[PDB]
């Protein structure tokens, strides 16, 4: 199962991380 940013379509990692097995710049 992929991130809910790749899933969803459009990452939402503005501020703090929640979701799992994440893989953004905006966040790592
Ligand atoms: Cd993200
Ligand atoms: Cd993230
Ligand atoms: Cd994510």
């Known amino acids: 199962d992929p991130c ?3 899933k969803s379509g459009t990452c ?4 703090s ?3 799992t ?3 953004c710049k905006s966040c790592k």
């Open 17 to 19: 991380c929640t979701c």
């Open 4 to 6: 809910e940013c790749s």
């Open 12 to 15: 939402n990692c503005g501020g």
């Open 21 to 23: 097995n994440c893989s």
